[PDB]
């Protein structure tokens, strides 16, 4: 702390209520990061850096002005939503500021129409918007979100050459893809999570996998899943075991960093930023557990950033970005594990001296190696100021403490799991999602696409409207699992049962009846405001003419 | 001329950059360049964000073509099964007709899979020369080296948790009216074509000339704010809020210049909290580096203090300051206290004209606080940097002004810089009220007995005035009627 952020009671009393009596006839960094002694740091009080530059050619400066085709149906539906590329109806700068800051130009508002009502829209435009919104229920209040790519610019040419005969345009491609993902979002929102049957199936799958291949995430150890960073199984009102919904990991609020529990469904960092795709931990092969981003985006285990001595967190309440990877020991990276023998990541070592058998943290937890945090806390273990303090303790296979049972079976379990993984590296049942949990779009989406191509009036073959529906499920796989559109809604009906939905409808009815009386009162208030405005405006003028007839 | 060959095999080529950077010529020439490069060319060098994605796609589809040296250990399903119930209830039961949920014609096969990969491979040169070339193991290091905001290229300072595929590329493009980031100039063109409204969300709680301040809430715009945080961390070193953005409230400064649409360009921002017990009034403040010492930071600090004053509290910034925060924000204190001293002098002069200096009025740190908006432990630093507080050798501390000329010179010199100032009469604001959830939609750990029907009767007690000038004049006149100390003490 420096001498600008401490207090003024480090003066003599100067209680600040005592009265003072006024009369008349370059760089001062003053202390250190934390507790220490006075020191000046004018060399650390530094600000400047290299530069900043200005580009000389605009985006719209680089564009091939050529246009080979035009549409013959509902060109106004395109000219509304996109940027109609002409010299449209504009105003003059000698009038704009007077009109939008003048004597009767009010401030804006989050409810002020996202359109410009000062200009008019035709009636053909509104009829076309109604025609489009009538294609399918989930198409009400539509807007083209999707954005064009350097590979879609190539796909478009092949589509134009094969099927649509130089008629499809970029805007219509973007519209087709946007409709496809709108419909997929509305299909996904309503998937019911689970019931007793699927719960039993998943718990039995977990137990029967652990019985053979071992586990680390806390699954399979017992009937009730444990934590995923400290293997804890207790809870209380101050920090609860909060389960996730993409995966099924559990965590403690303070062991993971959940400052507040949302009222809907909880989604962890990996199932929130990216999707549950089997990611790449930098420090160990296995990818299943509680992950957290680093200062750049990669995904490291919480169980690994703690135990690696050079890794720490930058905020002990949020547990936000893992830090300190760029200064891990070259010897640490040159070590190689002894249970899975894989040549990736960084390992920790045995404790007892005259031993240098290393192993990954998650491989250790899978095998069954002795690891104990000691009397430390998760927060101190994370803070990295533990170096001058005592240490944490583990052991290898043949250095187990007294009573720690055999783990040869453990290393065999781990080797078997990684061996099966390495082998797998190389009433009508219908498959509807790829092995990586990405979707594949069914017949109805192609039907909707045909209806839209009809609306715009192109030569539409069903093969041409099934090609795009194929290519969608592959563009949504190249990307990892992230939806191609920036849009998303916070709604999660999902896990709701039937009676709960019934009660929710019953209460929504009451709130709906109430808001109408409220709206009546609101419009009465508005009318009264207009009345009093006009009254005052007339009264001013009449009193003026009475006080001065001239 | 156009091309020239030397005698030492150093060939000069001249061209036209306008044509070279085109978005159509790029794909045209990439399509024919990409097969000319032998597909057995071993790229043993670094790992691009592009090649990593392509090679992961191949390894997932199980295709027999590999060029990278980093084999993923678990990049596929752990237990691939084809008898689970997931294929008997297609789409969770959300579609009911068999002709409608049958996918016999929409499953991709090897042929279109290979054609897709060919489409992907034929774009490489253009994807690169769009995402990584500037118009003017190495995985732990981020590659981002510019940020193209309006049309300028803004070198960052620190590293933000942008997604992996954005951090492997060394240019990001951000749309100011929306704060969305993309890694390609073509995609940026497409998006600036689509996006139409030229205004942030939220209301407009101030306006004067060009400058305007929009009050974006926190839990209603959970994307605008989540991108503003990532844009902030690239310049603000010590900050660790990126996703839990609901308990916060953002106040955004925009500069308007004038389709005929009103264009409101982002200029800076400061944040705030809805309920804190440390008596702060600000969390982070930022101005985009395209300024040149123009006054918007002092503007926004004066604004935060106006909000605290109109709320009738005291406050200070979140304390872990920076070396560029404090050097700019310990001048604000000096000028504030100089202004208040001149105000006290000029208000006493109207009645102390016929009198003598024999009496010394008694001013206090609480009575400077209630005029300024800041706490006494900051008025002390103001007076210290102004060199006016004396602990001479009852009278343990005094405020001695050797000559008003130095102080009025300080104020006039700071005023000559023509900074923009806040005008208290253009603010359309009312301090926010918080229900049984404190401005969030979440945790349950007061009771639902608030009922909020008060705040209407608070006209009753005419003591706590609603205006600011009223309380200012009250403090300036009432508490300064006391008989002054006789000057007979010392020299």
């Amino acid at each position: 702390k420096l001498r600008e952020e401490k207090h003024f009671q480090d003066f003599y009393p100067d209680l600040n209520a005592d009265t003072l009596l006024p009369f008349i006839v370059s760089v001062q960094t003053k202390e250190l990061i934390f507790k220490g002694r006075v020191t000046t740091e004018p060399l650390v009080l530094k600000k400047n850096e290299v530069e900043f530059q200005k580009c000389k050619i605009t985006t719209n400066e680089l564009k091939g002005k050529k246009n080979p085709y035009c549409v013959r149906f509902n060109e106004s539906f395109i000219s509304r939503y996109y940027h109609i590329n002409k010299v449209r109806n504009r105003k003059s700068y000698k009038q704009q500021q007077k009109e939008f800051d003048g004597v009767e130009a009010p401030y804006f508002t989050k409810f002020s129409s996202k359109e410009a009502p000062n200009i008019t829209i035709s009636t053909s435009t509104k009829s076309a918007i109604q025609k489009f919104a009538s294609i399918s229920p989930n198409l009400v209040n539509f807007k083209p979100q999707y954005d064009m790519d350097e590979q879609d610019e190539l796909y478009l040419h092949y589509l134009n050459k094969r099927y649509f005969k130089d008629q499809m345009s970029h805007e219509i491609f973007e519209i087709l893809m946007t409709t496809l993902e709108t419909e997929w979002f509305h299909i996904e929102k309503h998937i019911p999570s689970t019931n007793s049957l699927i719960a039993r199936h998943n718990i039995l799958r977990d137990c029967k996998n652990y019985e053979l291949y071992g586990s680390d995430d806390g699954t399979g150890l017992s009937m009730d899943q444990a934590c995923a960073v400290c293997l804890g199984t207790d809870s209380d009102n101050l920090n609860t075991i909060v389960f996730c919904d993409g995966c099924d990991i559990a965590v403690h609020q303070e062991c993971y960093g959940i400052i507040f529990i949302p009222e809907g469904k909880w989604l962890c960092r990996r199932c929130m930023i990216s999707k549950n795709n089997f990611a790449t931990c930098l420090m160990c092969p296995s990818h299943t557990g509680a992950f957290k981003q680093t200062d750049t985006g990669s995904w490291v285990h919480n169980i690994c950033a703690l135990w690696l001595p050079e890794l720490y967190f930058s905020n002990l309440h949020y547990m936000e970005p893992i830090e300190g990877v760029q200064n891990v020991s070259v010897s640490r990276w040159k070590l190689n594990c002894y249970i899975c023998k894989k040549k990736m990541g960084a390992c920790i070592q045995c404790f007892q001296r005259n031993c240098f058998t290393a192993y990954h943290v998650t491989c250790a937890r899978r095998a069954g190696l002795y690891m104990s945090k000691g009397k430390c806390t998760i927060q101190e273990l994370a803070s990295n100021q533990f170096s001058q303090k005592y240490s944490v303790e583990s052991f290898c296979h043949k250095h187990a403490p007294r009573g720690w049972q055999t783990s040869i079976e453990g290393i065999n379990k781990a080797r078997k799991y990684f061996s099966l993984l390495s082998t797998l590296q190389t009433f009508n049942k219908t498959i509807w999602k790829t092995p990586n949990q990405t979707p594949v779009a069914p017949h109805v989406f192609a039907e909707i696409l045909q209806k839209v191509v009809d609306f715009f009036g192109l030569a539409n073959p069903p093969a041409g409207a099934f090609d795009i529906c194929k290519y969608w499920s592959m563009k949504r796989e190249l990307t990892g699992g992230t939806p191609l559109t920036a849009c998303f809604e916070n709604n999660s009906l999902g896990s709701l049962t039937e009676e709960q939905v019934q009660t929710r409808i019953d209460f929504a009815n009451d709130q709906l009846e109430d808001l109408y009386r409220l709206k009546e009162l609101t419009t009465l208030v508005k009318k009264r405001t207009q009345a009093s405005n006009s009254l005052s405006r007339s009264r001013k003028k009449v009193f003026d003419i009475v006080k001065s007839p001239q | 001329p156009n091309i020239e060959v030397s005698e030492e095999l150093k060939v000069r080529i001249k061209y036209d950059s306008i044509k070279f950077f085109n978005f159509e010529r790029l794909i045209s020439k990439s399509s024919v360049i990409a097969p000319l490069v032998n597909k057995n060319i071993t790229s043993s060098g670094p790992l691009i964000g592009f090649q990593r994605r392509v090679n992961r796609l191949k390894q997932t589809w199980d295709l027999a073509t590999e060029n990278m040296e980093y084999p993923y250990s678990s990049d596929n399903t752990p237990f691939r099964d084809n008898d689970s119930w997931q294929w008997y209830v297609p789409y969770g039961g959300t579609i009911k007709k068999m002709k409608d949920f049958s996918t016999k014609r929409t499953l991709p096969t090897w042929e279109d899979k290979i054609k897709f990969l060919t489409f992907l491979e034929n774009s490489k040169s253009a994807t690169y020369i769009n995402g990584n070339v500037s118009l003017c193991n190495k995985v732990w290091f981020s590659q981002i080296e510019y940020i193209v905001l309006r049309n300028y290229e803004i070198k960052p300072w620190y590293t933000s948790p942008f997604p992996e595929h954005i951090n492997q590329n060394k240019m990001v493009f951000i749309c100011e009216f929306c704060l969305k980031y993309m890694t390609s100039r073509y995609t940026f063109y497409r998006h600036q074509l689509k996006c139409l409204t030229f205004k942030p969300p939220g209301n407009e709680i101030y306006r004067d000339g060009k400058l305007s301040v929009w009050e974006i809430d926190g839990r209603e715009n959970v994307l605008y704010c989540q991108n503003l945080c990532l844009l902030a961390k690239c310049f603000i070193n010590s900050k660790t809020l990126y996703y839990d953005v609901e308990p916060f409230i953002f106040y955004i400064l925009t500069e308007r210049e004038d389709q005929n649409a009103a264009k409101f360009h982002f200029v800076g921002y400061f944040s705030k909290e809805k309920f804190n017990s440390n008596d702060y009034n600000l969390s982070c403040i930022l101005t985009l580096p395209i300024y040149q010492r123009k006054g918007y930071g002092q503007f926004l600090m004066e604004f935060s203090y106006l909000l605290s004053r109109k709320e009738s509290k005291f406050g200070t910034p979140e304390k872990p300051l920076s070396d560029l925060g404090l050097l700019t924000y310990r001048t604000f204190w000096k000028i504030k206290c100089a202004e208040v001293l001149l105000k006290l002098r000029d208000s006493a002069r109207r009645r102390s004209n016929n009198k003598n200096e024999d009496t010394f009025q008694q001013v206090s740190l609480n009575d400077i606080a209630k005029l300024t908006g800041m706490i006494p432990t900051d008025v002390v630093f103001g007076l210290e940097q102004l060199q006016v507080l004396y602990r001479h050798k009852d009278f343990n501390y005094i405020i001695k002004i050797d000559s008003w000329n130095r102080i009025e010179n300080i104020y006039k010199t700071w005023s000559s810089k023509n900074y923009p100032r806040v005008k208290y009469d253009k603010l359309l604001w009312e301090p926010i009220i918080l229900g049984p959830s404190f401005g969030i939609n979440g945790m349950m750990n007061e009771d639902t007995v608030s009922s909020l029907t008060e705040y209407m009767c608070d006209y009753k007690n005419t003591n706590n005035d609603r205006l600011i000038y009223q309380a200012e004049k009250r403090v300036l006149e009432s508490i300064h009627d006391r008989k002054g100390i006789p000057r007979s003490k010392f020299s």
């Binding site: - | 010590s238 440390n278 982070c284 404190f438």
Partner: peptide, 12 residues
């Protein structure tokens, strides 16, 4: 109810 600021303290 616990208030936590959008910032982190000094390291050493």
């Amino acid at each position: 109810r616990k208030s936590t600021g959008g910032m982190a303290p000094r390291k050493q």
